[PDB]
């Protein structure tokens, strides 16, 4: 069931109890976690944080802890599966699920005793009616009933199929948690920023539509203005500090405030794809764009911070003018920035890329948990050192992304299988270890598809979805496979590959695991890849 009162039904229930907090490995989840942690600190809630990358870790951790805890909180995991069936818990165990994954499992929706969904009830939700999916030598009296039961069960299969076909995401969990803090009158300025970063994570990863993003930006604008007014109230005692969040109609250029304009232009998907920067011709057109701006060469190639103050104040208008001249209409974006002092100013997307690079780091200097915690720590104002380190890792990730895309396109490795495009990375692919985790591979695939649609002349191919594979375990001969929807500005960002992969694996008896919280990312036996993809082609044709 859904929670109608976050205070009485959730927070006041758990704050006096011992709580196990499961947190998925995405920035929105980290941000939601930071907010809840700050609340739990204020109220001295006894809890244990268990970071989880996928279902196996969660299920294992649950077995390890189910005896010492009866109150569980799941952040960005659990909503899209029959949680009671998978975990097989005791009757007294309560699960609070704050997860953006859609669709919500019907059992999670209609269970009243153990599943408590911390999900806004006015989210995009189209749940089936209870009557359609749950029930309570023979004469005609009995056989007619049998016939009706069979027809009901048949409709039920169709109804649940339609309901579970497309995966997508609802409102940011960080935003939901911020609302809780607001209700508790404990919404610190830091929490509002974390809510913003969480929303921005969804946007960066194309998890939500442009319309939903703009709508939610509008909501957060209200809170930013309320906080600004609060920071001017002399009688206010809550979160009295100098930390200022500001709404920004800023440039669609990644990390541009932390390296050169040239680097940002070359490593932003929007411009890299549209200028076709994998080609010399493309690189030439970019130089013509920079020439049309009339900006000096030194000012473009040097770090942004060392730019003439007069040029910084005109850059938004200058770049947008040249952009309009080249027919680019979306150089400007609605977002937020946070200011600490001096040059310590960060756009929301900067923090997303930094936090993501820390969390998804493939380094051996620490385990996945260490990196997760480092990412979680980087969100605290207390020290910006981790954030700045994250920004350096982000630059590397972005450069490697551009190089990988160039290799894929110039080596002609993005090939239509009919109903979908296919491409893959191999063990010998440079920087493959930067793209071997679900999150990193999925984001790479979306960036690659964006560049591909700009590159291709084939009108049919422009509208195709993409399937992308990378090496998982060489020892066990497994690969990770991701599926993403067709790339369009107006996309509803809904994804059918989860159930498509499932049916393809079943009809071929392929050895496959749905370990990621998104069903559109699977682990597959390399030996089965051939028949698996063959079945998938037939299925989607």
Author numbering: 1 to 136, 162 to 566
Paper lines:
The X-ray crystal structure of human Cdc45 was solved at 2.1 Å using the anomalous signal of crystals derivatized with the mercury compound thimerosal. A construct with an 11-residue excision (lacking amino acids S154 to I164) crystallized readily and was used for high-resolution structure determination. Crystallographic analysis reveals that human Cdc45 adopts a compact, disk-like shape, resulting from folding of the polypeptide chain into a closed arc, from its N- to the C-terminus. The only deviation from a globular fold is represented by a large helical insertion in the DHH domain, spanning amino acids L118 to S197, which projects away from the folded core of Cdc45 (discussed in detail later); the insertion consists of the low complexity, acidic region, which is almost entirely disordered, followed by the seven-turn helix α6 pointing away from the Cdc45 fold. Our crystallographic analysis shows that Cdc45 bears a remarkable three-dimensional similarity to the RecJ exonuclease, which reveals their homology despite very little sequence identity. The fold consists of an N-terminal DHH domain connected by a three-helix motif (α15 to α17) to a C-terminal DHH-Associated 1 (DHHA1) domain. Superposition with RecJ confirms the identification of Cdc45 residues that occupy equivalent positions to active-site residues in motifs I–IV of RecJ; the structure shows that three out of the four active-site motifs of Cdc45 contain inactivating mutations, providing a structural basis for its known lack of nuclease activity. The structure shows that the DHHA1 loop reaches down across the groove that separates it from the DHH domain and inserts F542 in a hydrophobic pocket on the DHH domain surface, lined by residues A24, G54, W55 and C77 and with V52, L58 as its base. As a result of these interactions, the DHHA1 domain latches onto the DHH domain, causing the steric occlusion of the inter-domain groove, which represents the ssDNA-binding site in RecJ. At its core lies a three-stranded antiparallel β-sheet (β6-8) sandwiched between a long helix (α9) and a helical bundle (α10-14).
Extensive experimental evidence has since demonstrated that cell division cycle protein 45 (Cdc45) is required throughout the process of DNA replication: it is essential for establishment of an initiation complex at DNA origins, and for chromosome unwinding and DNA synthesis at replication forks. More recently, Cdc45 was shown to be an integral component of the Cdc45-MCM-GINS (CMG) assembly responsible for DNA unwinding in the replisome. Recruitment of Cdc45 to the MCM2-7 heterohexamer is a key step in the highly regulated process that leads to the activation of helicase activity. Evidence concerning structure and function of Cdc45 remained elusive, until recent reports identified it as a remote orthologue of bacterial RecJ333435, a 5′-to-3′ single-stranded (ss) DNA exonuclease with multiple roles in DNA repair and a member of the DHH phosphoesterase superfamily.
